[PDB]
Design a protein around this ligand. Structure first.
Ligand SMILES: [K+]
Ligand SMILES: [K+]
Ligand SMILES: [K+]
Ligand SMILES: [K+]
Ligand SMILES: [K+]
Ligand SMILES: [K+]
Ligand SMILES: [K+]
Ligand SMILES: [K+]
Ligand SMILES: [K+]
Ligand SMILES: [K+]
Ligand SMILES: [K+]
Ligand SMILES: [K+]
Ligand SMILES: [K+]
Ligand SMILES: [K+]
Ligand SMILES: [K+]
Ligand SMILES: [K+]
Ligand SMILES: [K+]
Ligand SMILES: [K+]
Ligand SMILES: [K+]
Ligand SMILES: [K+]
Ligand SMILES: [K+]
Ligand SMILES: [K+]
Ligand SMILES: [K+]
Ligand SMILES: [K+]
Ligand SMILES: [K+]
Ligand SMILES: [K+]
Ligand SMILES: [K+]
Ligand SMILES: [K+]
Ligand SMILES: [K+]
Ligand SMILES: [K+]
Ligand SMILES: [K+]
Ligand SMILES: [K+]
Ligand SMILES: [K+]
Ligand SMILES: [K+]
Ligand SMILES: [K+]
Ligand SMILES: [K+]
Ligand SMILES: [K+]
Ligand SMILES: [K+]
Ligand SMILES: [K+]
Ligand SMILES: [K+]
Ligand SMILES: [Mg+2]
Ligand SMILES: [Mg+2]
Ligand SMILES: [Mg+2]
Ligand SMILES: [Mg+2]
Ligand SMILES: [Mg+2]
Ligand SMILES: [Mg+2]
Ligand SMILES: [Mg+2]
Ligand SMILES: [Mg+2]
Ligand SMILES: [Mg+2]
Ligand SMILES: [Mg+2]
Ligand SMILES: [Mg+2]
Ligand SMILES: [Mg+2]
Ligand SMILES: [Mg+2]
Ligand SMILES: [Mg+2]
Ligand SMILES: [Mg+2]
Ligand SMILES: [Mg+2]
Lengths: 120, 133, 50, 87, 107
RNA sequence: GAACGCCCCGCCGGCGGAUGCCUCGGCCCGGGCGGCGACGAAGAGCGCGGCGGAGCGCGAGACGCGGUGCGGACCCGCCCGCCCCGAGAAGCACCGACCCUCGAACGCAGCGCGCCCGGCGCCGCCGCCUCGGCGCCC
RNA sequence: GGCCCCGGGGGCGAAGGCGGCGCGCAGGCCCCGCCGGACCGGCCUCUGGUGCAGAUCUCGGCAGCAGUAGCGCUACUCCGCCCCCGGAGGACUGAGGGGGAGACGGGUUCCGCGGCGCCUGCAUCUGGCCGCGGGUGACUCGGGCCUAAGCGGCGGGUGAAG
RNA sequence: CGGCCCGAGGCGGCGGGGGCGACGGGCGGAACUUAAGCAUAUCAGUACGCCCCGGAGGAGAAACCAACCGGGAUUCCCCGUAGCGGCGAGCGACGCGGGAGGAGCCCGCCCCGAAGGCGCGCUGUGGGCGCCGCGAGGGGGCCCGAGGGCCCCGCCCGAGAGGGUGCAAGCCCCGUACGGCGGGCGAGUAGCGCUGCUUGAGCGUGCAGCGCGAAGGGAGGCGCGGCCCUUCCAAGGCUAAAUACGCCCCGGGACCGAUAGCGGACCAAGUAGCGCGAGCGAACGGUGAAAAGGACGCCCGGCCGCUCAAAAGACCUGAACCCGGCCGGCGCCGGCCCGCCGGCCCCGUCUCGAAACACGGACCGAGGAGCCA
């Protein structure tokens, strides 16, 4: 059970931050009760995961904000860059690899490829 | 004779597949017949067993009809109501003799939205096959 | 020694913390017959080199 | 008295825990590890002991990043992303 | 390996349909005194041979003829035999349900 | 003589783990694939479960969080929880995040300290700012 | 790999084990009774990691010997009632201590309650053993700082490199 | 005081560093061993140490081979003796021929001169297979703890590959067969002399140090000098394919079956344990269809009996060596019914010769040595 990430979606940043503060103090209270009942020990589990959900939502909203803030620059923060391996980031582009000198290109546009059949 | 070459015919691999199967496969592996009446009504030959189905047993030393109280998927067996090990006391609790789902025909089905829908899905696919053939 | 660094203290503390037996409800839950944790140790015959 | 009596004069630690490989192999006076070779930048590896090689190598740990990257390549969207980049 | 190579040449044949898998290669004389009177398949046709029929190196390459500008003829009979081969091939070629020739062309 | 010892005319017991049968394991061949890293790898340490030692997994959001699909009654013990034409347990696949200390390991050190209020490692390429020279000239 | 005349033998009892007869010059084979509780072959053709008394053979189990050889540090006794606890007696260690405390090494052995399956080469109601809870607080003590003998670093130098 | 030249500190963007038991490239580089000794030789241009990429890599479009009624870049596969050598032991290419695959090109030089990628550059830029899903068809009678067993009568079959189910199942259940989505031409150079390594390369196969050092030059498996002939253009660069391979995933097998097969089949093996360290490294698989994992009563652990087909009771079967209780009797061969008479040294081995005071062997089980190219 417990709070749903959809029901935290579309809520203001300060409502979210106060709800996180409440959950933190609640886990302190509950941990104190543990060190000093079925409903209480179920609530402890549900509340750990409620904290996790609030923090998930806060991070997702902030990330979308920042990725709009940097959308059209020349230098993007490395966190928002494409997901690619080291090798792929270092490879040449297909256009760069298919670039041809002028004289070679001219002689390649002269006599292009042709479909033909040969009989017996 | 098999023709498909991504499917093993190796006893070691088949037995290891039967054990260590995941839960969805195990649930599908625990199927049983529908009776003739339900075969006529739903036009379906087999269903995965469930709590709330009434089952008529044969071929065993514990023969009778009862409702499915529990499903022991690790063992691939089902605990039916009324079908027990013979107890020692006159008072002591019942203890279920576990029945294997292929030793039964389901007599009356538990129904809900998902059961209805998956049955209709299966009918339409069998109809595609029957139109092809 | 009575004069020990925190790093050696912490690794010794973990050995002490994990030197325990299998819980009985764990034995019942997991359906075990082996009930001795053979990674236990005793200070008299051990040579912890931490 | 070169045996049992001489064994009673041992109250020193020659080696301690290594910061890189974690073994009781870091020599506390030479300041250099006899198992992995720390503080060398490269790891100590020898072909005359393949059992020593198999004891600590790629795969005896978690392989967390490489595991995710391989599954993403083999079945996820990574090569499509490569095509979009390399356009 | 036999199956692997058969699959590869099947894929290539589909890709380039209806071209043949092979180029037109010349007829040449085997090198030894021991293999003196028989012919075999060479690498390419000489520019002298192409000048026989008209085609240039690029034009012949385009219409599917191996061209070897490093070879030099050793006599006039070499030329006559290979110009007959070129001339007949250019007879028998069509250029665009078509038929894809198989194996070596004019063995 | 009895008894001890020995052989077995047979009947029962111990100690030990051979033989027989079985096999979620090995080995050989062939086919795929050939996919890591300063955006922090491989590896190491420590910690994380309601009752939690080992191994798997995870990282202070810790025995896991979210999104899209599928699936459709369970969840090894004790507890909880779910249950329904959708209300959603087991399970599966992709994608988005979190990601403590050490480690090519990057303020110095390895667990102790700094300079400064952003932060503060080495090499190289291309630019740029500010500069030196009784180099050649003006 | 084949055959085994309506398609070879098997819970109406397979393989193996223990006794017994029969056949064969022999290697070996066949049957019966008891145990056991799921697989096994005769004939033709094919293949091999194909037959043990020995190797100071390897691994495992195990006999006689045999209830045998064996169990420094002066010492215990009576009663409550065990080598434990109490009281009374008799002794010892003898201030370079069988005393009181630190450094190194050990790593929880520390404390309280409970206990005797293992250990405590005899016993135990004892315990450094086993279970369950606990436990080490610094402006002034030490480490952090300084430098010793040393060790590392330094535009660079050298070496096929490391 | 400015320009150009040669340097210094800082800042920004970008790149490098480490990791792998294979395949691949570059270096350094043994000894055991064989020669029935041992130096050259061989092992071996191997082990091992250092460096460097990739999905392949390297190589590559003749300063080639040849001697023909001639071929024509590179790689790989089939095929087979010239020669080297204490001319001993040993070692050893290749062309021609048949196939897999096939692909060609440009910088400097020369002409234009900023036409260029314009804070640079005239000490020269620019041009000439995987993802989904359906899926046929057997009863009746005996008996068992249990029908996949026995008897008798049938169905499906593009499916009689197989796994499960309380005992051998096409028809009890998963699967199996039949289909859908994504789809004008290179200088401290070439060559030569001396020296060291390397090669089948032999008065030099390839490399290198040092000294000398060209113009038309290189090659033609025996040196030097001269004349010819045949055939190529070094000292600069790029390039697909046919080829090779561990880890991990997938399928198969006249392979092993728990002292075997990997060291490792067992919820926790490179684990427990051992060594200051480099490193070394085990043993341990199996109840039953179902845990039904042991009622009631009686003594004060035992006895009775209970579950189950059965205790199979901490577990399948349960041999030998060795031992305890009851019963019988007091070594091999042969005759006789049975305790007499006759014969009998401890095997294996080396050896002229073993019972030897020659050596190995307390007992028992399982393993254990002429196979392959
Ligand atoms: K990479
Ligand atoms: K202390
Ligand atoms: K100790
Ligand atoms: K001594
Ligand atoms: K060291
Ligand atoms: K065999
Ligand atoms: K004795
Ligand atoms: K006590
Ligand atoms: K050098
Ligand atoms: K060498
Ligand atoms: K040698
Ligand atoms: K020698
Ligand atoms: K020698
Ligand atoms: K020698
Ligand atoms: K020689
Ligand atoms: K040699
Ligand atoms: K010789
Ligand atoms: K070809
Ligand atoms: K069944
Ligand atoms: K020169
Ligand atoms: K030279
Ligand atoms: K040689
Ligand atoms: K010679
Ligand atoms: K010289
Ligand atoms: K000549
Ligand atoms: K030569
Ligand atoms: K010559
Ligand atoms: K082993
Ligand atoms: K002998
Ligand atoms: K001898
Ligand atoms: K003799
Ligand atoms: K003898
Ligand atoms: K003898
Ligand atoms: K004698
Ligand atoms: K004697
Ligand atoms: K004797
Ligand atoms: K002898
Ligand atoms: K002797
Ligand atoms: K001897
Ligand atoms: K002897
Ligand atoms: Mg020292
Ligand atoms: Mg754990
Ligand atoms: Mg053998
Ligand atoms: Mg013998
Ligand atoms: Mg005294
Ligand atoms: Mg105490
Ligand atoms: Mg004792
Ligand atoms: Mg002080
Ligand atoms: Mg010799
Ligand atoms: Mg050689
Ligand atoms: Mg290459
Ligand atoms: Mg040589
Ligand atoms: Mg083994
Ligand atoms: Mg037994
Ligand atoms: Mg002896
Ligand atoms: Mg044997």
């Amino acid at each position: 059970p417990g709070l749903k990430a959809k029901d935290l979606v579309g809520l203001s940043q300060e409502d979210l931050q106060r709800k996180l503060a409440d959950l933190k103090r609640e886990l302190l209270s509950l941990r104190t009760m543990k060190a000093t009942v079925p409903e209480r020990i179920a609530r402890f589990r549900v509340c750990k995961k409620d904290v996790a959900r609030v923090l998930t939502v806060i991070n997702q909203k902030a990330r979308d904000e920042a990725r709009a803030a940097f959308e059209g620059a020349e230098h993007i923060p490395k966190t928002f860059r494409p997901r690619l391996t080291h090798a792929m980031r270092c490879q040449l582009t297909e256009k760069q690899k298919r670039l041809l000198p002028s004289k070679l290109m001219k002689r390649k546009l002269q006599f292009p490829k042709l479909k033909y059949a040969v009989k017996v | 004779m098999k023709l498909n070459s991504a499917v093993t015919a190796s006893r070691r691999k088949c037995r290891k597949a039967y054990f260590t199967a995941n839960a969805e496969t195990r649930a599908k592996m625990m199927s049983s017949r529908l009776s003739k009446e339900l075969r006529a009504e739903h036009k379906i030959k087999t269903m995965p067993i469930r709590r709330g189905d009434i089952v008529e047993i044969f071929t065993g030393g514990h023969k009778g009809t009862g409702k499915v109280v529990e499903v022991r998927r690790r063992d691939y067996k089902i605990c039916v109501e009324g079908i027990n090990q013979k107890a020692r006391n006159p008072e002591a609790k019942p203890v279920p003799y576990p029945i294997h789902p292929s030793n039964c025909i389901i007599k009356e089905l538990y129904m809900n939205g998902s059961r209805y829908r998956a049955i209709k899905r299966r009918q339409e696919r069998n109809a595609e096959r029957l139109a092809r053939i | 020694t009575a004069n020990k660094t925190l790093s050696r203290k912490l690794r010794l503390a973990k050995k002490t913390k994990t030197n325990k037996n299998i819980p009985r409800w764990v034995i019942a839950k997991d359906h075990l017959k082996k009930t001795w944790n053979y990674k236990r140790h005793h200070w008299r015959r051990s040579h912890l080199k931490l | 008295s070169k045996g049992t009596a001489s064994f009673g004069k041992r109250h020193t630690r020659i080696h301690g825990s290594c910061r890189r490989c974690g073994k009781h192999s870091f020599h506390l006076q030479k300041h250099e590890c006899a198992s992995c070779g720390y503080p060398s930048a490269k790891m100590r590896r020898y072909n005359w002991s393949y059992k020593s090689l198999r004891r600590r190598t790629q795969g005896t740990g978690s392989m967390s990043h490489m595991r995710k990257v391989y599954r993403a390549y083999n079945s996820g969207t990574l090569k499509a992303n490569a095509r979009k980049y390399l356009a | 390996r036999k199956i692997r190579r058969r699959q590869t040449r099947l894929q290539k044949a589909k890709a380039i349909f209806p071209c043949p898998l092979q180029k037109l290669r010349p007829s040449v004389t085997r090198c030894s005194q021991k293999f003196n009177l028989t012919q075999r398949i060479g690498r390419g046709f000489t520019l002298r041979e192409l000048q026989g029929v008209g085609l240039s190196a690029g034009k012949a390459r385009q219409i599917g003829i191996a061209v070897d500008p490093r070879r030099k003829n050793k006599s006039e009979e070499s030329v006559a035999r290979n110009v007959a081969r070129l001339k007949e091939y250019l007879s028998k070629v069509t250029i665009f349900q078509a038929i894809q020739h198989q194996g070596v062309v004019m063995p």
